[PDB]
Scaffold this active site. Structure first.
Site, PDB file in Angstrom:
ATOM      1  N   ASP A  90       0.853  -1.131   0.002  1.00 28.75           N
ATOM      2  CA  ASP A  90      -0.153  -0.246  -0.068  1.00 28.75           C
ATOM      3  C   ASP A  90       1.258   1.122  -0.446  1.00 28.75           C
ATOM      4  O   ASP A  90       0.441   2.148   0.106  1.00 28.75           O
ATOM      5  CB  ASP A  90      -0.877  -0.043   1.198  1.00 28.75           C
TER       6      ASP A  90
ATOM      7  N   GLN B 261      -5.661  -1.550  -7.105  1.00 27.86           N
ATOM      8  CA  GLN B 261      -6.602  -0.478  -5.656  1.00 27.86           C
ATOM      9  C   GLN B 261      -7.411   0.341  -6.731  1.00 27.86           C
ATOM     10  O   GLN B 261      -7.113   1.064  -7.910  1.00 27.86           O
ATOM     11  CB  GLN B 261      -5.547   0.186  -4.912  1.00 27.86           C
TER      12      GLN B 261
ATOM     13  N   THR C 175      -7.810   4.711  -0.242  1.00 29.00           N
ATOM     14  CA  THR C 175      -7.951   3.410  -0.601  1.00 29.00           C
ATOM     15  C   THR C 175      -9.377   3.625  -1.013  1.00 29.00           C
ATOM     16  O   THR C 175     -10.151   2.884   1.030  1.00 29.00           O
ATOM     17  CB  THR C 175      -7.312   2.588   0.084  1.00 29.00           C
TER      18      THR C 175
END
Lengths: 263, 265, 263, 269
Positions: free
Chosen positions: C182, C256, C206
């Site tokens: 991430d 993502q 996110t």
């Protein structure tokens, strides 16, 4: 009329443990009967219902189907337990957890059925209406007018019998007895206070309903419902019930608490 | 013994609606008492427990803690309702649904406490037991002693005075938790009384299926309460008991109902 | 500072499927790594994680623990599946479904690692800032300015390695790679619009994060994170990533979508 | 053929969040399209699906209905999230979490469509499949025109990329949500077999076990499925008895409308 009630307690299967019921605000006994049917479909055939506990959370709308979702809690060496959710417009209106056991001989004892008048002598509720046939014929020992109370002991006795032929299937008799257990029950709590349950300003609502099926029975012969209200306090009313067959056998016990509020 | 139980009914919190409880096979009253605390935390402060229904699914293991998960079911205009799962070893051992309501004034009636001898004359269970054997969190004085090892064909009734063995806070919530615990004593065994078997006799398989309770009125457990139990039925390798709990002055404070397995093998 | 992540991912068991994890908004990678640990505790020894999908429902709170509740979804002939619910303040903040498979011999192919400078010649993010220690050392091919920003292509390459020696347990490398996955990811989608990820009045978070672990690997040697944003439209930006090791082996892929909004 | 599939994807409502779907083992695309329909019914009308993730847990049986249970996870200021369970015989066959958002304006960029021959010069799969059908023979709901043909019964060693043009066989309604369900369905064709290309094994050869594990999709931009769309697929990896494929879907004018990811089992016995 019985035929129609029985058809209505016989639910439509949507999937394993998902059923859909039609309605006769819904009578609590309809939701009870239907939930028993739903749970019993998800259990081994030999394991019949011996107990349940339920809570009523919202009123059911009689013009709309009710979906019964059945969660398998446990299947043990003796017991099968299930939780039923009654759903309408995406919200639960009622939950029941019920348990099921294989028939088996064991220790036997029971209390004594109260001394009451037999049914033959007594007038039905449909007949006391004379001053459409009901699915279950009720013959009270004492008439308690829902529109005018009178201060009476907190005890009520009522004979009842299915208004018609019943099939030889004990499971059907159990669903109907679940249905039948929610008549002549909670209003018993108002008797010492002198108010009929349908009087203006009376708010009466079932909170919970629980039942134990001790022994086999048939609903095509007479059973007696003996009800006592042992307590009222805090805008609640509490009733205990026992169901005897005509020969005195204790068949089932019931417990219910409700709101009883004068406005 | 009472401070230990009372600490043990005071649950270690993990999150909103998740609690961990130490154990004292586990005594049903502990699970019941712990589950009530768990649910009462998630309810609004003015609303007190008026009823619960529970089922026991698997025996609890005394050597491990218990997690209590609490599902919020509804928040009504007067009633709140919670479902508590008791979880051990990845598996639910117990489920309670309980309801809570704000104290309010309405219609009052009750039945009448049975006539029994007062507690003062009566010997405690600890003392009786000593003949055929420590401090206990709740003191019990039976009206008639039903010996768990022996026993005869007796009427299916039992009467037991009880009181907390120690000092209790002025928080009614803790009394209630403790009353839930105490309601699982001297109860289901009444169902064996007509059959001349004591509950600790070898071969006797006795086990609670369900336990339910209704808390009608406020009370305190630092004075004597009476437990009046009857077994109205036994059949099918089950025994059925109903209880009523009265204070000394005769006020009906709670009622209980329980079914259990009773099997001689 | 790496020792304090590896301990922070070794979750406190409450009961089977219930887990407490300390926080260090929580990062996201923190939640992913902990979630992956929670799930792996519930699976057979031989089966390692191969994929997960996750959604972010609410911001974490760094001040507090997170409970990770794990539902067992399936245990097949090869594959086990788990759903992890990350709970804080009685609300779900995040959900992950993860699948696990035992390592087996099969068809092999992969694409080719992008052509980029090697890590040995590159400055770390701790060195460019010099122009406290980090758990993972990062050497970017191109440093971007999080409070500044100018228009570039939607591609990002950064080498990474754990700041420390790690254990020989592949599981811990996977928890850590999930954490690392991430970093240097969603901001890539801004690169074409000239905006840094710490610019004021830029809303960025996110929505969802998913990963596939193709091959074994170690995070105590250099890995390259190769990231592209293929799209941005309706307040969302979309990135895809691939992670190669020093020798060009493709070890994991990521995807993502995130909110990217100008207040 | 199109009409019949559109009627299959339009589910029967049993209650709030409870639907039942009939089947054309079950094709993954049917489960996906039906699940998106189920989830969308529970969300505000203006919030359209922007993403989903799914796992396939057991094969579905075509001869029986599938019940779709929809769980409300969050309704926030912009996003509604829903988890759909597909149930058969009291067991979940498939789970999907889907997210929905308010159609609006924001930052706009995309990559570039691959340069491929247009669909006018390309034969259809159904016409090509004559001569080996003795993968499919008569009318299909979606017309497919591949740039290169891949015979499911005889592989040839090829690069792990596939490009196929596709379009609904007929007039579609003017409702975008239907186009999205049908695009969810379409997204599971010409997909996972791409991972077998470097290994020269056709996906229907004896002994080849091929099975979707997971399927995910992102709807970037509005589109219509009654004009030609290009599915650009690559398999970036296989190992461990798994195959991994990424897809991007473009309209003819070059707009990137959706992206996809799937991993499946690919094992020769």
């Amino acid at each position: 009329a019985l035929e129609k009630l029985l058809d209505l307690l016989d639910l439509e299967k949507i999937e394993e443990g998902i059923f859909r019921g039609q309605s006769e605000q819904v009578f609590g006994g309809q939701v009870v009967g239907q939930a028993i049917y739903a749970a019993k479909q998800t259990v081994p055939a030999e394991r019949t219902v011996h107990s349940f506990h339920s809570y009523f959370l919202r009123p059911g709308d009689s013009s709309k189907p009710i979906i019964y979702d059945v969660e398998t809690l446990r299947d043990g060496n003796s017991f099968s337990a299930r939780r039923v959710s009654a759903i309408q417009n995406g919200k639960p209106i009622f939950y029941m957890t019920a348990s099921f056991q294989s028939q088996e001989e064991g220790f036997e004892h029971q209390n004594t059925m109260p001394d009451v008048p037999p049914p033959e002598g007594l007038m039905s509720e449909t007949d006391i209406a004379r001053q459409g046939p009901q699915p279950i014929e009720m013959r009270p020992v004492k008439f308690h007018n829902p529109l005018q109370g009178s201060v009476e002991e907190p005890n009520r006795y009522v004979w009842f019998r299915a208004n018609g032929k019943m099939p030889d299937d004990l499971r059907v008799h159990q669903y109907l007895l679940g249905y039948a257990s929610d008549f002549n029950f909670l209003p018993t709590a108002l008797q010492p206070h002198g108010i009929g349950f349908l009087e203006p300003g009376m708010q009466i609502a079932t909170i919970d309903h629980s039942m134990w099926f001790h022994r086999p029975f048939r609903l095509d012969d007479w059973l007696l419902y003996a009800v006592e209200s042992t307590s009222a306090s805090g805008a609640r009313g509490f009733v205990r019930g026992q169901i005897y067959n005509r020969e005195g056998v204790l068949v089932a016990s019931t417990v219910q608490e409700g709101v009883i509020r004068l406005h």
